[PDB]
Amino acid sequence: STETLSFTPDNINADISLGTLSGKTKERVYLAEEGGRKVSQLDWKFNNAAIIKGAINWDLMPQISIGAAGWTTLGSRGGNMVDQDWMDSSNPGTWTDEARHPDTQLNYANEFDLNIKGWLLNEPNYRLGLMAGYQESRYSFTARGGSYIYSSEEGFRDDIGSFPNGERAIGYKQRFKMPYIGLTGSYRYEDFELGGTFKYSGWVESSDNDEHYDPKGRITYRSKVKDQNYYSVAVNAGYYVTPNAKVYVEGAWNRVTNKKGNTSLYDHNNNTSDYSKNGAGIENYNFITTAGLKYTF
Ligand SMILES: CCCCCCCCO[C@@H]1O[C@H](CO)[C@@H](O)[C@H](O)[C@H]1O
Ligand SMILES: CCCCCCCCO[C@@H]1O[C@H](CO)[C@@H](O)[C@H](O)[C@H]1O
């Protein structure tokens, strides 16, 4: 089993699949000089965005395998976005302004992953291995128009208006660099196979770019968070239609826990910039449902 000294650059298997990606990311702003309370929060979300997913696995030795994976959206997907503010420092906890944007879309999203697997168990009917790898994912959104419910000077959720259809918009990009460790495995009875994979990271580095388009309030925000936590849980079920062709179905969840980081503001109008330590926060989570084929050459 895992105690067999040999080399097999010959052992390779490919994995191609289709499915959907659903998720949500929360963009937060904090005021250091005010207890570090939350003052802004943008909630970008979207469901069933079609994606193509694939992997190439090299089972070089009984002890270790190398793998490269990736997925990307197959076109855009309309979503939703909500922007709230807590301008009342005497009542932080209840939002004072809420802007809704149904006209939002996930322009695109993708991810690649390179890893190594150290097999603890490697038999014909069951596999258990440690993992170590690196992943990078990107997201890009755009919100347009929408309605609001702001708070006047001496009022509260009174200034209930509406935005110019298509005007004032916002662009939001993100990047997640994730070095990680994991556990993967699968048991096989007859031609049926059940498997799972778990990932963890405490070294995540996320960064985002928020574009506020409006020849009036045209600002650019940039944030970066470090040593952020990441968790992932995936499970699959499949059948060996042929000795070396597995048809399978899979479900994956993953989360990036919120943490504070630094942010930089760029006001194009006044050509003024502003830096604020621990002024930003970033978090997200995703659900990936997929089905496909794993061919072992
Ligand atoms: C097999 C891969 C097919 C990829 C094609 C995806 C087509 C959907 O893609 C979408 O089409 C819209 C209409 O033109 C555009 O406005 C969007 O920007 C684009 O993302
Ligand atoms: C078989 C594999 C098909 C892959 C289809 C890829 C279609 C490319 O998709 C494109 O990705 C860009 C990201 O840079 C987006 O900005 C574009 O709006 C999107 O259409």
Coordinates of C-alpha atoms and ligand atoms in Angstrom, one line a residue:
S1 CA 0.0 0.0 0.0
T2 CA 1.5 3.3 1.2
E3 CA 4.7 1.3 1.9
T4 CA 5.6 0.4 -1.7
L5 CA 8.8 2.1 -3.2
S6 CA 8.1 2.7 -6.8
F7 CA 7.5 5.6 -9.3
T8 CA 4.7 5.8 -11.8
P9 CA 4.6 9.1 -13.8
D10 CA 2.3 7.0 -15.9
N11 CA -0.6 7.2 -13.4
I12 CA -2.8 10.1 -14.4
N13 CA -6.5 11.0 -14.2
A14 CA -8.5 13.9 -15.5
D15 CA -11.7 15.4 -14.0
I16 CA -14.2 17.6 -15.9
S17 CA -17.5 18.7 -14.5
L18 CA -20.3 21.2 -14.7
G19 CA -22.5 22.9 -12.1
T20 CA -23.4 26.0 -10.2
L21 CA -21.8 28.4 -7.7
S22 CA -23.8 30.3 -5.1
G23 CA -22.4 32.7 -2.5
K24 CA -22.2 35.9 -0.6
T25 CA -19.5 38.3 0.4
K26 CA -19.7 41.1 2.9
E27 CA -17.7 44.3 2.5
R28 CA -17.3 46.2 5.7
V29 CA -15.9 49.6 6.8
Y30 CA -14.8 50.6 10.3
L31 CA -14.0 53.9 12.1
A32 CA -10.9 53.5 14.2
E33 CA -11.3 56.9 15.8
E34 CA -14.7 55.9 17.1
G35 CA -14.2 52.6 18.8
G36 CA -13.7 50.8 15.5
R37 CA -17.5 50.5 15.1
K38 CA -19.0 49.3 11.9
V39 CA -20.3 52.1 9.7
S40 CA -20.7 50.5 6.3
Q41 CA -21.6 47.0 5.0
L42 CA -22.1 45.9 1.4
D43 CA -23.8 42.5 0.9
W44 CA -23.1 41.1 -2.6
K45 CA -24.9 37.8 -3.3
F46 CA -25.8 35.5 -6.2
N47 CA -27.3 32.1 -6.9
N48 CA -26.8 29.3 -9.5
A49 CA -24.1 30.9 -11.6
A50 CA -23.0 28.2 -14.1
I51 CA -19.4 27.0 -13.8
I52 CA -17.1 24.7 -15.6
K53 CA -14.7 22.8 -13.2
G54 CA -11.6 20.6 -13.9
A55 CA -8.7 18.8 -12.4
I56 CA -5.6 16.9 -13.4
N57 CA -4.0 14.4 -11.0
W58 CA -0.6 12.8 -11.2
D59 CA -0.3 9.8 -8.9
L60 CA 3.5 9.7 -9.1
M61 CA 4.2 7.5 -6.1
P62 CA 2.1 5.4 -3.7
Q63 CA 3.1 8.0 -1.1
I64 CA 2.3 11.2 -3.0
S65 CA 0.2 12.8 -5.8
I66 CA 0.4 16.2 -7.4
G67 CA -2.8 18.0 -8.5
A68 CA -3.8 21.1 -10.4
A69 CA -7.5 22.3 -10.3
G70 CA -9.6 25.2 -11.4
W71 CA -13.0 26.4 -12.2
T72 CA -14.6 29.5 -13.7
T73 CA -18.0 30.9 -14.4
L74 CA -19.6 30.2 -17.8
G75 CA -20.8 33.8 -18.3
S76 CA -22.3 36.4 -16.0
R77 CA -25.1 36.1 -13.4
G78 CA -27.5 38.6 -12.0
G79 CA -27.4 38.9 -8.3
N80 CA -28.3 41.4 -5.6
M81 CA -26.5 43.9 -3.4
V82 CA -27.4 45.9 -0.2
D83 CA -25.5 48.8 1.3
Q84 CA -26.2 49.9 4.9
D85 CA -24.8 52.5 7.1
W86 CA -24.7 53.2 10.8
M87 CA -24.1 56.9 11.0
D88 CA -25.6 57.3 14.5
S89 CA -22.7 56.7 16.8
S90 CA -25.2 57.0 19.7
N91 CA -27.2 54.1 18.4
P92 CA -24.7 51.9 16.5
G93 CA -26.6 48.7 16.0
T94 CA -29.5 50.0 14.0
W95 CA -28.8 51.1 10.5
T96 CA -29.6 54.6 9.4
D97 CA -29.4 54.2 5.6
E98 CA -30.1 51.3 3.3
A99 CA -29.6 51.2 -0.5
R100 CA -31.0 48.2 -2.4
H101 CA -29.7 47.2 -5.8
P102 CA -31.6 44.4 -7.6
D103 CA -29.8 45.3 -10.8
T104 CA -26.5 43.7 -9.8
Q105 CA -24.5 40.9 -11.4
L106 CA -21.5 38.6 -10.8
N107 CA -19.4 39.5 -13.9
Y108 CA -17.2 36.6 -13.3
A109 CA -15.4 34.4 -10.8
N110 CA -12.7 31.8 -11.0
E111 CA -10.2 29.7 -9.0
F112 CA -7.1 27.6 -9.5
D113 CA -5.5 25.3 -7.0
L114 CA -2.2 23.5 -6.9
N115 CA -1.6 20.8 -4.2
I116 CA 0.3 17.8 -3.0
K117 CA -1.2 14.7 -1.3
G118 CA 0.6 12.5 1.2
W119 CA -1.2 9.2 1.3
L120 CA -1.6 7.6 4.8
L121 CA -3.7 4.9 3.3
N122 CA -3.7 3.9 -0.4
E123 CA -5.5 0.8 -1.3
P124 CA -7.8 -0.3 -4.2
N125 CA -11.0 0.3 -2.3
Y126 CA -10.0 3.2 0.1
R127 CA -7.7 6.2 0.1
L128 CA -6.8 8.7 3.0
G129 CA -4.3 11.5 2.4
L130 CA -2.9 14.7 3.9
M131 CA -2.9 17.8 1.7
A132 CA -0.9 20.9 1.4
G133 CA -1.6 23.5 -1.3
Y134 CA -2.3 27.0 -2.6
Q135 CA -5.5 28.5 -4.0
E136 CA -6.4 31.8 -5.6
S137 CA -10.0 32.9 -6.4
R138 CA -11.3 36.1 -7.9
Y139 CA -14.7 37.8 -7.9
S140 CA -16.1 40.8 -9.9
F141 CA -19.5 42.5 -9.4
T142 CA -21.4 45.6 -10.6
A143 CA -24.5 47.3 -9.1
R144 CA -26.7 49.8 -10.9
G145 CA -29.6 52.0 -9.9
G146 CA -31.9 50.6 -7.2
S147 CA -34.0 52.2 -4.4
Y148 CA -33.1 53.7 -1.0
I149 CA -34.3 54.7 2.5
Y150 CA -31.9 57.2 3.9
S151 CA -32.0 59.2 7.1
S152 CA -32.4 63.0 6.9
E153 CA -30.5 65.4 9.2
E154 CA -33.0 65.3 12.0
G155 CA -35.0 62.3 10.7
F156 CA -34.9 58.5 10.8
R157 CA -35.5 56.3 7.7
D158 CA -37.6 59.1 6.3
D159 CA -35.7 60.1 3.1
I160 CA -37.2 57.2 1.1
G161 CA -36.3 57.7 -2.6
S162 CA -35.2 56.0 -5.8
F163 CA -32.1 56.0 -8.0
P164 CA -31.7 56.9 -11.8
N165 CA -32.2 53.7 -13.7
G166 CA -28.7 52.5 -14.6
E167 CA -26.8 55.6 -13.4
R168 CA -24.8 55.7 -10.1
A169 CA -23.1 52.3 -10.0
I170 CA -20.5 50.4 -8.1
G171 CA -17.7 48.0 -9.2
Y172 CA -16.4 45.4 -6.7
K173 CA -13.4 43.1 -7.3
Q174 CA -11.9 40.6 -4.8
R175 CA -8.9 38.4 -4.6
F176 CA -8.2 35.5 -2.2
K177 CA -4.7 33.9 -1.9
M178 CA -5.0 30.8 0.2
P179 CA -2.1 28.6 1.4
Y180 CA -3.8 25.6 3.0
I181 CA -3.7 22.2 4.6
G182 CA -6.3 19.4 4.2
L183 CA -7.6 15.9 4.5
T184 CA -9.1 14.0 1.5
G185 CA -10.4 10.5 1.1
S186 CA -12.8 8.0 -0.3
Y187 CA -14.1 4.4 0.3
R188 CA -15.2 2.0 -2.3
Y189 CA -17.7 -0.8 -2.1
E190 CA -18.1 -2.8 -5.4
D191 CA -18.4 0.0 -8.1
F192 CA -19.8 2.6 -5.8
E193 CA -17.7 5.3 -4.2
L194 CA -18.2 7.9 -1.4
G195 CA -15.6 10.6 -0.7
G196 CA -14.8 13.8 1.1
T197 CA -12.3 16.6 1.4
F198 CA -11.6 19.1 4.2
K199 CA -9.4 22.2 3.9
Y200 CA -8.2 24.8 6.5
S201 CA -6.2 27.9 6.4
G202 CA -5.0 30.6 8.8
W203 CA -2.9 32.3 6.3
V204 CA -5.4 33.7 3.9
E205 CA -4.8 37.2 2.4
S206 CA -7.8 38.9 0.7
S207 CA -7.9 42.2 -1.1
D208 CA -10.6 44.1 -2.8
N209 CA -11.2 47.1 -5.0
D210 CA -14.4 49.2 -4.7
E211 CA -15.2 51.6 -7.5
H212 CA -17.8 54.3 -6.8
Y213 CA -18.8 55.6 -10.2
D214 CA -20.4 59.0 -10.2
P215 CA -18.8 62.2 -11.6
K216 CA -19.9 63.7 -8.3
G217 CA -18.7 61.1 -5.7
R218 CA -16.1 59.2 -7.7
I219 CA -14.0 57.4 -5.1
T220 CA -11.8 54.4 -5.2
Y221 CA -11.3 52.0 -2.2
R222 CA -8.7 49.4 -1.7
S223 CA -8.4 47.0 1.2
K224 CA -6.2 44.0 2.2
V225 CA -6.7 41.6 5.1
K226 CA -4.0 39.2 6.4
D227 CA -3.8 35.9 8.4
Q228 CA -7.5 35.3 7.7
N229 CA -9.2 31.9 8.3
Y230 CA -10.6 29.7 5.7
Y231 CA -12.5 26.4 5.9
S232 CA -13.8 24.1 3.4
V233 CA -16.0 20.9 3.3
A234 CA -16.7 18.8 0.2
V235 CA -18.3 15.4 -0.3
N236 CA -18.9 13.3 -3.4
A237 CA -20.7 10.2 -4.6
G238 CA -20.0 8.3 -7.8
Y239 CA -20.1 5.1 -9.8
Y240 CA -17.5 3.3 -11.9
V241 CA -19.3 2.9 -15.2
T242 CA -16.1 1.3 -16.6
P243 CA -13.0 0.2 -14.8
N244 CA -11.5 3.6 -15.3
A245 CA -14.4 6.0 -15.7
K246 CA -16.2 7.3 -12.7
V247 CA -19.4 9.3 -13.0
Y248 CA -19.9 11.5 -9.9
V249 CA -21.8 14.2 -8.1
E250 CA -20.4 16.6 -5.6
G251 CA -21.2 19.3 -3.1
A252 CA -18.8 21.9 -1.6
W253 CA -19.0 24.6 1.0
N254 CA -16.3 27.1 1.9
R255 CA -16.0 30.1 4.1
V256 CA -13.6 32.9 4.7
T257 CA -14.1 34.4 8.1
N258 CA -14.3 38.1 8.6
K259 CA -11.2 39.9 9.9
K260 CA -10.1 43.6 9.8
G261 CA -7.4 44.9 7.5
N262 CA -6.2 48.2 6.2
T263 CA -7.9 50.3 3.6
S264 CA -6.9 53.2 1.2
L265 CA -9.2 55.8 -0.2
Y266 CA -8.7 57.7 -3.4
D267 CA -10.9 60.7 -4.2
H268 CA -10.6 61.5 -7.9
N269 CA -12.6 64.7 -7.6
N270 CA -10.5 66.4 -4.9
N271 CA -7.4 64.3 -5.8
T272 CA -7.3 63.4 -2.1
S273 CA -6.3 60.1 -0.6
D274 CA -6.8 58.7 2.9
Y275 CA -5.4 55.7 4.8
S276 CA -7.0 54.0 7.7
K277 CA -5.5 51.1 9.7
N278 CA -8.0 48.4 10.5
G279 CA -10.6 50.4 8.6
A280 CA -11.7 47.5 6.5
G281 CA -13.2 44.0 6.7
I282 CA -13.8 41.2 4.2
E283 CA -15.6 37.9 4.4
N284 CA -17.5 35.5 2.2
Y285 CA -18.7 31.9 1.6
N286 CA -19.8 29.8 -1.3
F287 CA -21.7 26.7 -2.2
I288 CA -20.6 24.7 -5.2
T289 CA -22.8 21.9 -6.7
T290 CA -21.3 19.9 -9.4
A291 CA -21.5 16.7 -11.5
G292 CA -18.9 15.2 -13.9
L293 CA -16.4 12.5 -14.8
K294 CA -13.1 11.3 -13.5
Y295 CA -11.1 9.4 -16.1
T296 CA -8.1 7.4 -15.0
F297 CA -5.9 6.8 -18.1
Ligands
LIG1 C1 -19.3 27.0 -23.2 C2 -18.9 28.4 -22.7 C3 -19.9 29.4 -23.2 C4 -19.5 30.8 -22.7 C5 -20.5 31.8 -23.2 C6 -21.2 32.6 -22.1 C7 -22.2 33.6 -22.6 C8 -22.9 34.3 -21.5 O1 -22.1 35.4 -21.1 C9 -22.7 36.7 -20.9 O2 -23.5 37.1 -22.1 C10 -24.1 38.4 -22.0 C11 -24.9 38.7 -23.3 O3 -24.0 39.0 -24.4 C12 -23.0 39.5 -21.8 O4 -23.7 40.7 -21.7 C13 -22.3 39.1 -20.5 O5 -21.3 40.1 -20.2 C14 -21.6 37.8 -20.7 O6 -20.9 37.4 -19.5
LIG2 C1 -14.4 24.9 -21.9 C2 -13.9 26.1 -21.1 C3 -14.8 27.3 -21.5 C4 -14.3 28.5 -20.7 C5 -15.1 29.7 -21.0 C6 -14.4 30.9 -20.6 C7 -15.3 32.1 -20.9 C8 -14.6 33.4 -20.5 O1 -15.5 34.1 -19.6 C9 -15.1 35.5 -19.5 O2 -14.2 35.7 -18.3 C10 -13.8 37.0 -18.1 C11 -12.8 37.1 -16.9 O3 -11.6 37.6 -17.3 C12 -15.0 37.9 -17.9 O4 -14.6 39.3 -17.7 C13 -16.0 37.8 -19.1 O5 -17.1 38.6 -18.9 C14 -16.4 36.3 -19.3 O6 -17.2 36.2 -20.4

